[PDB]
Design a protein around this ligand. Sequence first.
Ligand SMILES: OC[C@H]1O[C@@H](O[C@H]2[C@H](O)[C@@H](O)[C@H](O)O[C@@H]2CO)[C@H](O)[C@@H](O)[C@@H]1O
Length: 272
Amino acid sequence: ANLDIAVYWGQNFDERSLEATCDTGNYAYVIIGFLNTFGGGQTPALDISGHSPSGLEPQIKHCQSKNVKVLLSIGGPKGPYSLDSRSDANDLAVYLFNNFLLPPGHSENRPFGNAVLDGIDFHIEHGGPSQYQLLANILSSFRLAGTEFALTAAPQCVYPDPNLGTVINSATFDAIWVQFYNNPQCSYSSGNAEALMNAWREWSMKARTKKVFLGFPAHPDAAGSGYMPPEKVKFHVFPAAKKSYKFGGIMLWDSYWDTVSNFSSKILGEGW
Ligand SMILES: OC[C@H]1O[C@@H](O[C@H]2[C@H](O)[C@@H](O)[C@H](O)O[C@@H]2CO)[C@H](O)[C@@H](O)[C@@H]1O
């Protein structure tokens, strides 16, 4: 096994804190969501469910000191975000670079203070491809300029993804976590994994990335559909998934629900 688990954080004001989330030892990646406001004349804004952005500075550092990678996710399930013009792609690329991916020059400007993030997560669920290809190109260019960080995406389970499909085809993403929930055509339902198993084969064969993660909801309440019990994921999915060269591990939506279900603890055998 030796499983890598990625988990989304920032979805509830009352959730287990980021540092306690990393201290669990269950995750290789923690993804903070969401920068859900940008483009269309709008100034970029975060919706991290009321957590203090400045307060996350020491927590992000602690998480990193324990070898947990911290990512910022742009877009999200909901939000007034859009990248319709070329200028919007350029503006957001420059803003993400200065304020999150580079060490501060002087600055009082940065939301997370002096924390330097390990990457950007594309969680685009509406708006089509737009200028997301251009945005990724500039971010990819900065990565080639010496600032080492990761670019990831969280597409829906139908391939190709209507919003990120063309961008994923450029092979720019280091890792992809496919959301195998909220869509019966490609996720687990009614004691039937057929739709899920066929979606997985397609993504692991066609997705032009080095690592593909399987995204599951940590709890029945966490998503409309697609919840699959831990004992079934290990029995059903892992044997066929670990046969793939592109198998990355699993992604969990989300930290708040995982704390309640203890889903990651069961899939690993309680670790630690
Ligand atoms: O670095 C930024 C800054 O966030 C501030 O919190 C705001 C939050 O972003 C906003 O959405 C909400 O409506 O109000 C809160 C505060 O009362 C936070 O106050 C700052 O400490 C933090 O550093």
